[PDB]
């Protein structure tokens, strides 16, 4: 049914106190954890991970609740799907592999986990790359008509259950494909490997998975924002060297010039636009992989 | 479907953009009542009889809603802009010989109404708007909190067929969700079940759903643009106007409603009513009294 898009990568079920993290593991060298985002799974890295795996031990993990990772029971505060909790869970996952100090690149929701990880537990990270995000606080702070329309899903998926769940159930295949297409530069699915789209489609076809994603966005509207707010107000800066990459046609470039933004959040950040929409590792895999190898090595 | 306007006639009013359905009852000065989303003219069924004691009450389905015809939309959502709807309702009233009339609108209908009053103030003797602020003001107040409260403004404005496709899986759920969510009580108890059935049946038609999305698309784009021009040009509604809003309704979450309306209207009085959004159904007596009082001098 589902293609193995990481030939030569192992498949690891990593136990944590909140459930298993699924990961493809390949390469040797310094550990590098890659976190996908919405509405994707770890397979979104399938075009860049082998290039990284030439120099790193590449752990391509499904976020908690996403893909084949277990889905911790949520609660009224969406706690396990807050980026703080996912970061803690991924730290615990990496510790199971003996990686207490690792490189981390995240895209989309995974990048939100990543920078929250960097804020909460900066000692865990050698270097951080975030792909096509600004901090969640910044999206919400920038919230206006234009951004509301553009990232409407931030407020739609954060509606109380079961409203988005029921609506997403109305046409899940359409919805996941629409998100994938609409955030690319092409506007269609041609930038993706069909076998990868199949992964995303099958994950999205599971109502429980969709519920988790809504939990993630609910956390994104509530606790994640509050956690970020604390850092902005404390002036807490990420001290880990970081790379901010963004799609010239991506989500982050609209709200505010991402490097300028991330510079408010990180003491040591470099940035570059990648000629792509949101899905940098799939729309622009060579460019993305090059940037990441250059930065991480 | 129940007749909720005993003794009211039924008019199909031809206009250049399609027929307007209306119930017509009473005698006296003409008073046009316009409903909003996701409702039809029947939302007035608790207040129209009281109004019909004093006015010729025309209870119209908005263009595209209820039993009114649905003009085909276009890429700018033109027929569902409030400007176009207002012109179409002016034409409808002219068909009845009403070239100068009182107007009370709720929700989208209220947006038609204030746009009517900006565009064609000579058509109105007095204007009442229920539980809205101008579209511009909602968008201008679109921060995190408000983006979450009226997420549907940005969700339903997403390009077709995204909201249509999600709404089609279980239309009943969404219409009942919206009816319930915007009431004070948070359920359907405020509504006459016969009225709910009207709303549900209207919502069950995919074309009607599409029109509603077109309305919201217009609300995100052209309506906003039209408003923006007026507010930036300092154009104010010169028609004496009543702004009623629900203490627990939508308008008051964005801002203090009379303060906002005083920026849009030279002659505005306002009162809150203990109600959620659906003033004529949640608080019919209070609504009906406020409207009778206002339109009666």
Swiss-Prot record, chain A:
The keyword Protein biosynthesis does not apply. Residues 30-268 form the AB hydrolase-1 domain. Keywords: Hydrolase. Gene3D superfamilies: alpha/beta hydrolase. The active site is at 108 (nucleophile), 278 (proton acceptor). Fluoroacetate binds at residues 109, 112, 153-154, 217. It comes from the Bacteria. The record marks 132 as: Important for enzyme activity. Its EC number is 3.8.1.3. Changing residue 217 to F: Reduced catalytic rate. Minor effect on substrate affinity. It catalyses: a haloacetate + H2O = a halide anion + glycolate + H(+); fluoroacetate + H2O = fluoride + glycolate + H(+); chloroacetate + H2O = glycolate + chloride + H(+). It holds the Pfam family Abhydrolase_1. It is an enzyme of class 3 (hydrolase). One of its GO terms (molecular function) is haloacetate dehalogenase activity. Homodimer. Belongs to the AB hydrolase superfamily. Epoxide hydrolase family. Catalyzes the hydrolytic defluorination of fluoroacetate to produce glycolate. Has lower activity towards chloroacetate and bromoacetate. This is Fluoroacetate dehalogenase. It comes from Rhodopseudomonas palustris (strain ATCC BAA-98 / CGA009).
């Amino acid at each position: 049914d589902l293609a193995d898009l990481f030939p030569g990568f192992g498949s690891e079920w990593i136990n944590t106190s909140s459930g298993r993290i699924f990961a493809r593991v390949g390469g040797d060298g310094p550990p590098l954890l890659l976190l996908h985002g919405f509405p994707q799974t770890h397979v979104m890295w399938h075009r860049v991970a082998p290039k990284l795996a030439e120099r790193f031990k590449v752990i391509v993990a499904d976020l908690p609740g996403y893909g084949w990772s277990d889905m911790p029971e949520s609660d009224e505060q969406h706690t396990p799907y807050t980026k703080r909790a996912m970061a803690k869970q991924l730290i615990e996952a990496m510790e199971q592999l003996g990686h207490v100090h690792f490189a981390l690149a995240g895209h989309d929701r995974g990048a939100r986990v990543s920078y929250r990880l960097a804020l909460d537990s900066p000692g865990r990270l050698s270097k951080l790359a975030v792909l096509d995000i600004l901090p969640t606080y910044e999206y919400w702070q920038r919230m206006n008509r234009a951004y509301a329309l553009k990232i409407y899903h931030w407020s739609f998926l954060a509606q109380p259950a079961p409203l988005p769940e029921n609506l997403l159930g109305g046409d899940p295949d359409f919805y996941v494909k629409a998100k994938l297409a609409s955030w690319t530069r092409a506007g269609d699915l041609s930038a993706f490997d069909p076998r990868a789209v199949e992964h995303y489609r099958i994950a999205f076809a599971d109502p429980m998975r969709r519920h988790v994603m809504c939990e993630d966005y609910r956390a994104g509207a509530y606790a994640d924002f509050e956690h970020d707010k604390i850092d902005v107000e404390a002036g807490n800066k990420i001290p880990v060297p970081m790379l901010a990459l963004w799609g010239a046609s991506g989500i982050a470039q609209s709200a505010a010039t991402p490097l300028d933004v991330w510079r408010k959040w990180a003491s040591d950040v470099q940035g570059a636009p990648i000629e792509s929409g949101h899905f940098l590792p799939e729309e622009a895999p060579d460019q993305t992989a090059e940037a990441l190898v250059r930065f991480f090595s």
